Design a protein around this nucleic acid. Sequence first.
DNA 1: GCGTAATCTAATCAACA
DNA 2: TGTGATTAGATTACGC
Lengths: 56, 56
Amino acid sequence: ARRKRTTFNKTQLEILVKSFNKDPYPGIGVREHLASLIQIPESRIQVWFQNRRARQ
Amino acid sequence: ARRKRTTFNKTQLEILVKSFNKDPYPGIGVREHLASLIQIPESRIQVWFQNRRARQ
DNA sequence: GCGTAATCTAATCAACA
DNA sequence: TGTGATTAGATTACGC
């Protein structure tokens, strides 16, 4: 009943890690910007940031 | 900065409440179906279902 | 002003590879 | 066999 597991390539992961090192708590504007930049739904990016902050 | 508060009209709330009374833990397919039906992003519908289960 | 949409942490599951 | 997705609790704080 779960969604298909989202896959991130090297460029998307690099951009996400750069934005995370800049700010671990991005606002809705920055999340929407990343969503339009790397072509990933914004909810997926919010989940990615939450998982990242959880692991560290 | 937070996202703008999503607004639901009477019809959207009615459809969501009927689907909730049918199944409080909808799969990704039903959430995407409701998203296409009432024209609301699927993440918003998942959040709505979680908040509903949270009240009840 | 209240109801409830939104966001976070802590925990757990499971899918693609 | 080894990280994205989901859930439950707390909270903050807009829209109507």
